[PDB]
Amino acid sequence: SDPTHLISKRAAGRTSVSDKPPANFKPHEKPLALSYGMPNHGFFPIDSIDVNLVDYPFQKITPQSTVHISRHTTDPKLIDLARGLQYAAVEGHAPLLQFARDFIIRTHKPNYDDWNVFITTGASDGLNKAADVFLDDGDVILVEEFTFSPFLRFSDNAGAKAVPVKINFDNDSDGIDLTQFVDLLENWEKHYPNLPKPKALYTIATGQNPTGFTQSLEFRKKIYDLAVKYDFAIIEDDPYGYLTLPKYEKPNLEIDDYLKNHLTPSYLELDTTGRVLRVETFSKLFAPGLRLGFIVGHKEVIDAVKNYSDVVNRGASGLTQTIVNNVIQENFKGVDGWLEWILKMRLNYSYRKDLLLYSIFESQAYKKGYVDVIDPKAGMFVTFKINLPKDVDVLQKMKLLLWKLISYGILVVPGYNMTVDLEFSKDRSNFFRLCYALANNDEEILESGKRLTDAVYEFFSNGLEFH
């Protein structure tokens, strides 16, 4: 079982990075190099780096935890500065590639053997790789109608067309409306008569950007079976699926439990043949300034993406791979230590969501029926629904209400900024995306949702004007 068929003409056809030696030849057993254009490590200005950490989020400065990064190391699980600040295999340093093979064995084991990982400069990097590796010029990619907008620059670069896939906005939505999704495929010729059959599905199955929704283990089985039947690849994008949130309890967990009953399976777990490419990032779990991530796919998909990175992004920062790999191994003692740090963030992220939602639930705006809120199963985004009258112009009134938000002093992202096709999605655009991740503290969350709901109350009180 292999996905060679799914891999692009463009990506397949890029070349790999010299014969029978003479009869009486043996290599010399310790040779010297006049070959590669590499400054010897003695040239590097950095001798050692001390990385000073925290035991938990929001802690202010038991003594401080420290990882020392020395010029040289014998530990096969650490990266020294001698290799870390030197030229490296583009696919990544071996210790960080291994930490990720194990992390994925622990959290989302692929249902087949011939899989591999590949260090990236983040999710967006990972998506652009996934787009290049699966889309030729003229292909259609299936994109969730409200999506992570940048993806369309990577599909558009690979020359593909984003066909939009309707989201169900019910409080129990999996996200993607399975019925309108089955119809699109069954009746492709009827909907898009002048476009080829879709090549791929770009889905943010868990903590969907920006809707909030998570696809259940039974919904994924169905989508995967649609992937096998109509033979399309799955680009899975999971930057914060590890941040599982329990459903709203009014405000004011061990590794085996989380892994067994809190964390929703990844499409990697359903995949037998390598038609799933998974995109991961250290952005929302460590810091966004790393520009570090990894993808998981079939050995031959990762190979193609290697040849692409050889052209457009020749390696993640080795100093960053060094600082991040050694913090995860020395401080956090590997896979299970990193899940314990991921779980600390869970509680914080968990507490914040519930606060923003309480914030909203006490408002006259919620009580009067003007706004509702989807309860996100994971991540850092809430869908904030605006119950405008049906007959009014969604885009016109949402634009006018955005200026009202900005005048009351609450910035949000409107739904209509996150579409594949604004005409296709205008009627389901009556929503702002809230993110409770950036705030400094609990009082900001409270004040944030006070203003958001105060503004919406004036907007409606005023009869949907700025009066």
Ligand X SMILES: *Cc1c(COP(=O)(O)O)cnc(C)c1O
Ligand Y SMILES: N[C@@H](Cc1ccccc1)C(=O)O
Ligand Z SMILES: O=C(O)CCCC(=O)C(=O)O
Specify the long-range contacts of residues 178-184, CB closer than 8 Å, at least 24 apart.
178/219, 178/222, 178/223, 181/223, 181/226, 182/226, 184/142
213 is in an annotated binding site: no
Q: Nearest 5°: CA angle at 11, between 275 and 205?
A: 35
Q: Which ranges of 187-316 does DSSP label H, i.e. alpha helix?
A: 188-191, 217-229, 255-257, 299-312
Give the residue with the Cβ less far from ligand Z, 124 or 325. Answer: 124
Q: Please check whether residue 207 is in contact with residue 376, taking contact to mean a CB–CB distance below 8 angstroms.
A: yes
- Tally of CA atoms within 13 A in the half-sphere of 180 that contains its CB: 15
**Which of the residues 262 through 321 are near ligand Y (CB under 6 A)?**
314-315
Question: Quick check: 410 binds its own copies (CB under 8 A)?
Answer: yes
Give the residue with the Cβ less far from ligand Y, 31 or 37. Answer: 37
Q: x-or-dash pattern for its own copies, window 84-123, by CB under 8 A?
A: xxxxx--------------------------------xx-
Give the CB-nearest residue to ligand Y.
314
CA atoms of 133 and 64, how far apart (whole Å): 44
**C-alpha distances in angstroms, 157 versus 161, 238, 301, 310?**
10, 22, 19, 17
Task: Select from 225-233, 256-264, 280-288, 390-398 the region that touches ligand X (CB under 6 A).
Answer: 280-288
Give the residue with the Cβ less far from ligand Y, 87 or 466. Answer: 87
Binding residue for its own copies, selected from 5, 34, 194, 256, defined by CB under 8 A: 34
Structure tokens at 83: 């290799």
291 is in an annotated binding site: yes
124 is in an annotated binding site: yes
384 is in an annotated binding site: no
Specify the pairing of strand 413-414 against strand 431-435: antiparallel
CA-nearest of 226, 278, 228, 199 to 11 is: 199
**Which of the residues 254 through 293 are near its own copies (CB under 8 A)?**
283-284, 286-292
**C-alpha distances in angstroms, 411 versus 363, 433, 449?**
18, 10, 11
Binding residue for its own copies, selected from 11, 78, 160, 412, defined by CB under 8 A: 412
Question: Quick check: 31 binds ligand Y (CB under 6 A)?
Answer: no
Sign of the dihedral through C-alpha 294, 295, 300, 301: negative
Binding residue for ligand Y, selected from 27, 37, 289, 369, defined by CB under 6 A: 37
Question: Quick check: 179 binds its own copies (CB under 8 A)?
Answer: no
Instruction: State phi, psi for 98 to the nearest 5 degrees.
Output: -75, -50
Residue 408 touches which of ligand Z, its own copies, ligand X, none (Cβ within 5-8 Å per kind) = its own copies
Give the residue with the Cβ less far from ligand Z, 56 or 87. Answer: 87
87 is in an annotated binding site: yes
Structure tokens at 96: 């960080």
Task: Select from 15-23, 121-129, 266-274, 295-303 the region that touches ligand X (CB under 6 A).
Answer: 121-129
**C-alpha distances in angstroms, 353 versus 124, 146, 381, 382, 431?**
25, 21, 8, 8, 17
Give the residue with the Cβ less far from ligand X, 325 or 363. Answer: 325
- Tally of CA atoms within 13 A in the half-sphere of 248 that contains its CB: 16
Question: Quick check: 43 binds ligand Y (CB under 6 A)?
Answer: no
Q: Smallest distance from the beta carbon of 309 to ligand Y, in angstroms?
A: 8
Question: Quick check: 309 binds ligand X (CB under 6 A)?
Answer: no
Please give the size of the binding site for ligand Y, defined by CB under 6 A: 7
Question: Quick check: 12 binds its own copies (CB under 8 A)?
Answer: no
Specify the long-range contacts of residues 68-72, CB closer than 8 Å, at least 24 apart.
68/330, 69/322, 69/323, 69/326, 71/41, 71/47
Q: Which residue ranges make up the site for ligand Z (CB under 6 A)?
A: 36-38, 87, 90, 124, 150, 314-315
Helix (H, G, I), strand (E, B) or coil at 99: helix
**C-alpha distances in angstroms, 352 versus 107, 230, 382, 393, 444?**
25, 41, 11, 33, 10
Question: Quick check: 239 binds ligand X (CB under 6 A)?
Answer: yes
> Residue 386 belongs to what H/E stretch?
strand 381-386
Residue 51 touches which of ligand Z, its own copies, ligand Y, none (Cβ within 5-8 Å per kind) = its own copies
Q: Please check whether residue 106 is in contact with residue 164, taking contact to mean a CB–CB distance below 8 angstroms.
A: no
209 is in an annotated binding site: yes
Binding residue for its own copies, selected from 182, 409, 421, 422, defined by CB under 8 A: 409
Q: Smallest distance from the beta carbon of 123 to ligand Z, in angstroms?
A: 8
Give the residue with the Cβ less far from ligand X, 110 or 239. Answer: 239
**Which of the residues 115 through 134 are near ligand Y (CB under 6 A)?**
124
Question: Quick check: 31 binds its own copies (CB under 8 A)?
Answer: yes
CA atoms of 211 and 221, how far apart (whole Å): 21
Question: Quick check: 369 binds ligand X (CB under 6 A)?
Answer: no
Beta bridge partners of 120: 293
CA atoms of 325 and 103, how far apart (whole Å): 12
Question: Quick check: 423 binds its own copies (CB under 8 A)?
Answer: no
Residues lying near ligand Y in the complex (CB under 6 A): 36-37, 87, 90, 124, 314-315
Residues of each annotated binding site for pyridoxal 5'-phosphate: 87, 123-124, 148, 209, 240, 281, 283, 291
Q: Which residues bind ligand X (CB under 6 A)?
A: 37, 122-124, 148, 204, 209, 237, 239, 281, 283, 288, 293, 314
Q: Which residues sit in the known binding site?
A: 87, 123-124, 148, 209, 240, 281, 283, 291
